[PDB]
Ligand binder design. Structure first.
Ligand SMILES: [Zn+2]
Ligand SMILES: [Zn+2]
Lengths: 472, 95, 250, 364
C-alpha cells in the first residue's frame, strides 16, 4: 500500500518546520543565555480512534531499549554512549532501514510539546522568555546586577534538573547580559560578561552584530557604528546613574538628552555633503547601493535609510516612546517630509530562506540554517565544530525544499470568500451562499519564493540549482 | 465670505487614526464610531481654518481638530481604562 | 416599484440577540418584498483603511479629476444617457422563459423550501422571514429583468444563474442566517471533554469513525455535526483540511 | 524518414471545450505570449475547478452522440420532487465526507444504493469513473436504489474526427491559433499511400521497463542486444522504465558517493557502451522515458506515485549522451509522436494493481 499516494502521508512528511519565540525590546535587567542538550533523548524517555498514531508497542519497546542503553552507558561504556548519541541521527535519516515517517512525526510533535512545557515551567517563577529554540534559550532575570544572580541561577538550574520530566536535560549557562538591545537573532547589541567572578569587577565586552548595516551605503556605515556605540554608552551611563540614585523604568528614561544636538548637527552636515557630492562622477563610488541576496527594497536616498535604521533601533525601548517619536520628527524635519509619510516607514531590508534540520555528522548536531540573513563563513561550516560542509548536499536540500514547496502549493485546498468553509464538492460553480473560491496558498507568495531562490542561486555559485530552475 | 480649502493634509495620519478609533470602541466598549466622525474631523478642521479668516487648511488646524476629537472620545469611558487609552492615543497628538 | 430603507430595533442588529425580535415587521408586509438586504458593520482595519482612503480622496479636492477619467476611458456612462437607455429598454424589450430555465427554477424552489423546513424543524419556531410562491415569482421576474438588460427576446441559463446567485445572497444573508439563534448544553460539555481526552494536539481522526462511535453511544448523529462545526467556528484548536475527512486539532 | 515529429506533454497544444456551443476552443500558450522570465508554468486557481467540468462535458457529449442514446438522462437536481419512478443518470461515483457512495453532477448530488446492483461484467468499477446508473428514487430518505450499472460505451477515431472535420490538434502540416481554425484532409490519403510503401524499412523497436544501469547482468544483456541490433539499425529506439533501481533523494552522509553523482555516473557508462556500436548511433534515434523513481519524482515522492505530467530527465545529468549520439530525445511520462498517418501514445506506469486493490465490491 505504501507506494500509493495519500494526502495524510504527504502532509506528515513535509511538515518539518520548528516554531520559535522572539520578543523584541530593550532590557535593562540581567539576562541569562542558557543552552539545552540531549532534548530528543529526554523526550523519548519521558513520555484505533486516532489514525495518525504510531504503534505504542514499538514506542515502549524502544523506550525500554533506550533506558537500558542509558544505564549501560552510565557504567563506563563508550560504545553505548556513542550509539545513544547517534540514535537521533538514525531517527532523522530515512536511508537507514526500518525507517518510518510516522515515528519521525510523532517524535517531532512530542519534542515540540516538551519544549513548550519547558517554557511553561521556566515561566512559573519570575522570568521572561526573550528567545526560544531547540538549542538556545534566553531568560530575563528580575535582578539588576550580574553579581547577585549566582545562587539564583544555580537554584533555578537545580530545580529544573530535579523535575522528573527534565531529569535527563543538560543545562549550561554561556553568557550574562548586563544591558541588551534585542530585536532578532542576527540583530542585537549589548554589554556581556562571560562568567561572574568573586571579589573582582567582571570583565565587560560589548558586541555588535547587525546584518542591517550591510544594506547601507559604503559611506554611512562608519557613522552607523559610531552612533550605535555612542547611544549604547549613553544607555549604560544613564542606567548606572539611576542605580546610583537608589510600563515606565527610570533606568533609561532620559538618555537621548545627551546627544540630541550633536546628532542634529551631524545629520545637517551629512545632508549638505550628500546634496553637494551626489551627482559628481568621481564621487559616485561611495553612494552605490550594495546588493545582497534576499534584498527587495528599491531606494534612492541613502541618508533616509540611515536615519530610519537609527530611529527604528531606538524605537525598541517600548518605555520612552514619546521622546523617540519627538526626536524622529525633528530628524524628519531636516528633510522636506512629514511624520506619517510612507517613505518614512522602516521595513526589513532582507527576506528569509531557512533550511530546517541540517545535520553535521561530525557532531550529530541539529540546527536550522538561513541562506539569506546569516553571514558567510557560517553557511559552509558547523556552528559548534569548524568543519566545512559539503556543498552539493546544500544544493540538493535546496532543490528538495523548492520541489516540496511546488507540490504543496499544487495540492492545496479551496476556501470560500465570505464564509471560510472548505470546498466539499468535486465540482461546483461557487459557494451555496455568495462568494467565489480562493486558494489557501496565494500565488504571489510562491512567486516571491521562486524569486528569492533565483537571488540565492545567483549570489553563490550553484550550477545544479540553476539547471534545476532552467528545466521549468 | 471665507471658504477654506483642503489640499495639503496627511492622508495616512487621519486614515490610521480612524482605523484606531474603529479598533477598541465597540470591540472593547460601547461607544459607536462610524464614517460620520471622519467627516466630523474634516469639518472641525475647516472650522478652525475659518476662525483665522484663511482660505486654506494648515497642519496646525488638523492637529487641533484631531486632538479635540480624540480627547472627547477618550474622556467618555470608564475609570478602569481611561488612563490606558490616554497613554495609548498619545502618539497622534504629540505636537 | 418600492425601495424602502429601515433600521432594526436596538440600532445595531445585535447578532447575539435572536433574529425574531430584531425586526418588528409582520409576515404579511415582508412577503411582498423580495430582496431583503441586511447590511452589517464590520471591523478588520483593512476595509476600514480602504474606506477612509476612499472618503478622504472623494473630498472634492481630488475626486473632481478622477471621475472625469472614468468618462474618458469609457469605464462609466453619464446619468442622462443611462436614463435614455433605461426608458428605451423598458419600451422595447420584454423577454420570455425557456423550459430548461423553468425546470431549474422549479428545482431551486423545492430545494430552498426543504431547507426552510429543516431550519424551522431545528429551531422550533416560525421563521421571521417567510418563503412562498411570491418568492418564485420574484426569482422569475429577476431573471426576466436580467435578460431585459441585453434586449434578448429569450431568457437563458446565463441570466438564471446570476439571478439565483442574487437570491441566494439575499436569502442566506437574512432568512437563513444563524437559524439556531445561539438535550440542551449538558451534552455539549460532555462531548468537548471526550475530544480533549481522546484526541491530543497535532493528531487527527477520520470523521466517519467519530460519527460511528458517537452514534453508537447516546450522542447520535444530529448532535455531533452541530457542535463539530461550532468548534470549527471557534477555530481555537480544531481545523478542517483535505475535504470533510481530516479533523485536525490545532 | 522525415515528416514525423515527437511531442511531449509540456509543448502539447491547449484546446478548451465549451458545452453551450459544442466546439473545442483554442487557448493561447503562456510560453509564447507570456514573459516566462521568472515563473509562468504555475496554473491559476480556477483550472482545478474547471478540469472536472471539462471531463464531464466531454463524457456527456460522447454519451449523447451514441446511436443507442438519442434514453434521455436527467440531471441529479431534478430528482428532488418525484419518487417511485425509474431514471437514467451519470456522474462522478465517489465517497462523500460522511463515508457513503454518492453521485456528483454539475447540478447536485444524491446518495446511492448498492445492495441489489447487477453490473455489466468486464469493467473495473473504481471510484472516480463516470458510470451510467439505473434505478428508482425514494423520498423517504435520499436513497437511489440502483438495479444496474454500466460504463458508457466508446467511439472510433473516424466518427470522432468527422464531428470537427479533420482538426490539426496534433497538427504537423499546420497549426491553429486564436485568430483562426484550420483543417486538412487532402494530404491524408497521400500520406497513407506513402506509408504503404517502405514501411518495413522504417521499423521501430521498444524494450521492457525498469532497466537498471547499475547491475552487471543488465549491462551484459544490453550489450548482447546491441551487438545484434548494430548490424541492422532500426528507425526509432525507445528506452523506457526507471534507469536506477534505488530512488534518489537527500544524502545525509558526506563519506561516500552522493546519490546525484552516482545518478550522473550511471549514464556516463552508457556513453562508453555506445562507442562500439557506431552503426546504431549513426542510423537510429534514441527515445528516453522517465519511470516512477527518476530524479524529479523520487526527489519528493521517494519512489511512490505522484504527479502524472513528469518532467523529462534533467539536462545536467545527460551531458555526454547528447554528444555521443546525434539523435536523442527526452520526453515526459505521457508522450505523443505523430507519424505520417499514425499517432502513438506511450504511458509508463502500473495499472493492474491500482485497479485490483481499489476495485469496488458488490454484495451478491
Ligand atoms: Zn559540527
Ligand atoms: Zn460562502
Amino acid at each position: 500500500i505504501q507506494n500509493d499516494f495519500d494526502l495524510n502521508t504527504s502532509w506528515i512528511m513535509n511538515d518539518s518546520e520548528f516554531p520559535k519565540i522572539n520578543n523584541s525590546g530593550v532590557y535593562d535587567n540581567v539576562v541569562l543565555d542558557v543552552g539545552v542538550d540531549n532534548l530528543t533523548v529526554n523526550t523519548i524517555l519521558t513520555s484505533e480512534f486516532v489514525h495518525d498514531a504510531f504503534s505504542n508497542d514499538a514506542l515502549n519497546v524502544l523506550r525500554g531499549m533506550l533506558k537500558e542503553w542509558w544505564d549501560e552507558a552510565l557504567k563506563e561504556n563508550s560504545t553505548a554512549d556513542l550509539l545513544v548519541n547517534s540514535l537521533a541521527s538514525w531517527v532523522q535519516n530515512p536511508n537507514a532501514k526500518l525507517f518510518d515517517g510516522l515515528l519521525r512525526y510523532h517524535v517531532h510533535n512530542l519534542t515540540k510539546k516538551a519544549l513548550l512545557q519547558l517554557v511553561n515551567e521556566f515561566s512559573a517563577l519570575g522570568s521572561t522568555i526573550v528567545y526560544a529554540d531547540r538549542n538556545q534559550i534566553l531568560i530575563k532575570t528580575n535582578k539588576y546586577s550580574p553579581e547577585n544572580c549566582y545562587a539564583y541561577s544555580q537554584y533555578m538550574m537545580k530545580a529544573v534538573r530535579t523535575n522528573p520530566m527534565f531529569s535527563y536535560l543538560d543545562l549550561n549557562i554561556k553568557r550574562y547580559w548586563d544591558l541588551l538591545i534585542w530585536m532578532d537573532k542576527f540583530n542585537f547589541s549589548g554589554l556581556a560578561c562571560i562568567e561572574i567572578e568573586e571579589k573582582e569587577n567582571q570583565d565587560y565586552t560589548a558586541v555588535s552584530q547587525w546584518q542591517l548595516k550591510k544594506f547601507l551605503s559604503p559611506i554611512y556605515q562608519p557613522e552607523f557604528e559610531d552612533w550605535m556605540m555612542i547611544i549604547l554608552d549613553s544607555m549604560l551611563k544613564t542606567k548606572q546613574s539611576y542605580l546610583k540614585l537608589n510600563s515606565v523604568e527610570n533606568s533609561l528614561n532620559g538618555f537621548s538628552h545627551l546627544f540630541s544636538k550633536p546628532l542634529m548637527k551631524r545629520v545637517k552636515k551629512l545632508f549638505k555633503n550628500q546634496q553637494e557630492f551626489i551627482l559628481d562622477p568621481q564621487y559616485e563610488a561611495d553612494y552605490v547601493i550594495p546588493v545582497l541576496p534576499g534584498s527587495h527594497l528599491n531606494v534612492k536616498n541613502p541618508l533616509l535609510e540611515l536615519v530610519k535604521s537609527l530611529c527604528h533601533v531606538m524605537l525598541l525601548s517600548k518605555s520612552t516612546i514619546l521622546e523617540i517619536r519627538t526626536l524622529r520628527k525633528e530628524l524628519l524635519k531636516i528633510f522636506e517630509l512629514r511624520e506619517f509619510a510612507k517613505v518614512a516607514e522602516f521595513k526589513d531590508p532582507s527576506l528569509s530562506l531557512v533550511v530546517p534540520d541540517f545535520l553535521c555528522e561530525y557532531c550529530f548536531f541539529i540546527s536550522d540554517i538561513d541562506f539569506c540573513k546569516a553571514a558567510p563563513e557560517s553557511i559552509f561550516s558547523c556552528v559548534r565544530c569548524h568543519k566545512a560542509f559539503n556543498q552539493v548536499l546544500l544544493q540538493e536540500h535546496l532543490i528538495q525544499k523548492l520541489r516540496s514547496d511546488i507540490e504543496s502549493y499544487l495540492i492545496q485546498d479551496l476556501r470560500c470568500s465570505r464564509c471560510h468553509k472548505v470546498k466539499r464538492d468535486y465540482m461546483s460553480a461557487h459557494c451555496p451562499c455568495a462568494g467565489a473560491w480562493e486558494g489557501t496558498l496565494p500565488r504571489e507568495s510562491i512567486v516571491q519564493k521562486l524569486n528569492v531562490f533565483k537571488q540565492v542561486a545567483k549570489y553563490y555559485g550553484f550550477d545544479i540549482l540553476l539547471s534545476c530552475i532552467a528545466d521549468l | 465670505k471665507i471658504y477654506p480649502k483642503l489640499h495639503q493634509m496627511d492622508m495616512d495620519k487621519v486614515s490610521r487614526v480612524y482605523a484606531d478609533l474603529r479598533r477598541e470602541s465597540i470591540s472593547t466598549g460601547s461607544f459607536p464610531i462610524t464614517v460620520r466622525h471622519l467627516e466630523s474631523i474634516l469639518r472641525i478642521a475647516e472650522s478652525f481654518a475659518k476662525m483665522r479668516l484663511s482660505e486654506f487648511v494648515s497642519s496646525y488646524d488638523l492637529d487641533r481638530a484631531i486632538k479635540v476629537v480624540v480627547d472627547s472620545f477618550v474622556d467618555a469611558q470608564k475609570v478602569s481604562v481611561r488612563r490606558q487609552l490616554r497613554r495609548s492615543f498619545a502618539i497622534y497628538t504629540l505636537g | 416599484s418600492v425601495l424602502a430603507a429601515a433600521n432594526p430595533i436596538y440600532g445595531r442588529y445585535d447578532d447575539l440577540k435572536s433574529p425574531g425580535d430584531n425586526i418588528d415587521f409582520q409576515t404579511t408586509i415582508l412577503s411582498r418584498f423580495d430582496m431583503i438586504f441586511i447590511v452589517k458593520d464590520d471591523h478588520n482595519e483593512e476595509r476600514d483603511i480602504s474606506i477612509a482612503n476612499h472618503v478622504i480622496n472623494i473630498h472634492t479636492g481630488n475626486a473632481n479629476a478622477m471621475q472625469n477619467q472614468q468618462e474618458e476611458n469609457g469605464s462609466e456612462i453619464s446619468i442622462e444617457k443611462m436614463k435614455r437607455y433605461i426608458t428605451y429598454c423598458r419600451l422595447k424589450c420584454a423577454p420570455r422563459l425557456s423550459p430548461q430555465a423553468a425546470e431549474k427554477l422549479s428545482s431551486n424552489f423545492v430545494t430552498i423550501r426543504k431547507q426552510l423546513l429543516i431550519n424551522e424543524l431545528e429551531s422550533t419556531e416560525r421563521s421571521s422571514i417567510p418563503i412562498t410562491i411570491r418568492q418564485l415569482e420574484a426569482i422569475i421576474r429577476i431573471t426576466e429583468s436580467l435578460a431585459k438588460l441585453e434586449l434578448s427576446p429569450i431568457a437563458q441559463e446565463r441570466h438564471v444563474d446570476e439571478a439565483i446567485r442574487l437570491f441566494q445572497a439575499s436569502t442566506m444573508d437574512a432568512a437563513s442566517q444563524d437559524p439556531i439563534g445561539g438535550t440542551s448544553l449538558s451534552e455539549i460539555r460532555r462531548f468537548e471533554q471526550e475530544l480533549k481526552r481522546r484526541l491530543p494536539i497535532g493528531w487527527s481522526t477520520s470523521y466517519q469513525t467519530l460519527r460511528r462511535e458517537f452514534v453508537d453511544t447516546h450522542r447520535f448523529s444530529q448532535l455531533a455535526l452541530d457542535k463539530a462545526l461550532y468548534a470549527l467556528e471557534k477555530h481555537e484548536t480544531i481545523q478542517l483540511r483535505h475535504q470533510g475527512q481530516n479533523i485536525y486539532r490545532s | 524518414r522525415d515528416y514525423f515529429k515527437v511531442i511531449n506533454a509540456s509543448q502539447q497544444q491547449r484546446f478548451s471545450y465549451n458545452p453551450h456551443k459544442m466546439q473545442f476552443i483554442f487557448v493561447p500558450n503562456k510560453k509564447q505570449n507570456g514573459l516566462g522570465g521568472i515563473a509562468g508554468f504555475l496554473p491559476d486557481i480556477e483550472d482545478k475547478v474547471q478540469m472536472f467540468l471539462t471531463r464531464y462535458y466531454l463524457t456527456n457529449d460522447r454519451v449523447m452522440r451514441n446511436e443507442n442514446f438519442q434514453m434521455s438522462i436527467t440531471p441529479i437536481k431534478n430528482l428532488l420532487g418525484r419518487d417511485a419512478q425509474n431514471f437514467l443518470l451519470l456522474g462522478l461515483l465517489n465517497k462523500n465526507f460522511k463515508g457513503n457512495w454518492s453521485l456528483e453532477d454539475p447540478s447536485g448530488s444524491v446518495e446511492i444504493d448498492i445492495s441489489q446492483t447487477i453490473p455489466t461484467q468486464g469493467h473495473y468499477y473504481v471510484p472516480g469513473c463516470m458510470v451510467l446508473v439505473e434505478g428508482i428514487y425514494y423520498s423517504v430518505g435520499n436513497k437511489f436504489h440502483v438495479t444496474s450499472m454500466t460504463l458508457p460505451p466508446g467511439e472510433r477515431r473516424e466518427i470522432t474526427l468527422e464531428t470537427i472535420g479533420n482538426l490539426d490538434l496534433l497538427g504537423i502540416h499546420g497549426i491553429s491559433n486564436n485568430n483562426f481554425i484550420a483543417r486538412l484532409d487532402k494530404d491524408l490519403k497521400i500520406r497513407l499511400h506513402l506509408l504503404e510503401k517502405e514501411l518495413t524499412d522504417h521499423k521501430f523497436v521498444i524494450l521492457g521497463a525498469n532497466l537498471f544501469l547499475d547491475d552487471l547482468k543488465i549491462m551484459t544483456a544490453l550489450s548482447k542486444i546491441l551487438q545484434k541490433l548494430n548490424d541492422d539499425p532500426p528507425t526509432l529506439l525507445i528506452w523506457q522504465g526507471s534507469f536506477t533501481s534505488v530512488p534518489v533523494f537527500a544524502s545525509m552522509s558526506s563519506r561516500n558517493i552522493s546519490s546525484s553523482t552516482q545518478f550522473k555516473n550511471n549514464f556516463d557508462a552508457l556513453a562508453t557502451l555506445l562507442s562500439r556500436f557506431d552503426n546504431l548511433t549513426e542510423n537510429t534515434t534514441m527515445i528516453f522515458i522517465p519511470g516512477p523513481n527518476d530524479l524529479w519524482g523520487s526527489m519528493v515522492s521517494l519512489g511512490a506515485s505522484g504527479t502524472l505530467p513528469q518532467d523529462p530527465i534533467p539536462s545536467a545529468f545527460t551531458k555526454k549522451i547528447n554528444k555521443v549520439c546525434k539523435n536523442v530525445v527526452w520526453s515526459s511520462n505521457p508522450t505523443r509522436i505523430a507519424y505520417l498517418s499514425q499517432e502513438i501514445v506511450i504511458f509508463r506506469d502500473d495499472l493492474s494493481g491500482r485497479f485490483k486493490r481499489h476495485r469496488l465490491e458488490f454484495p451478491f
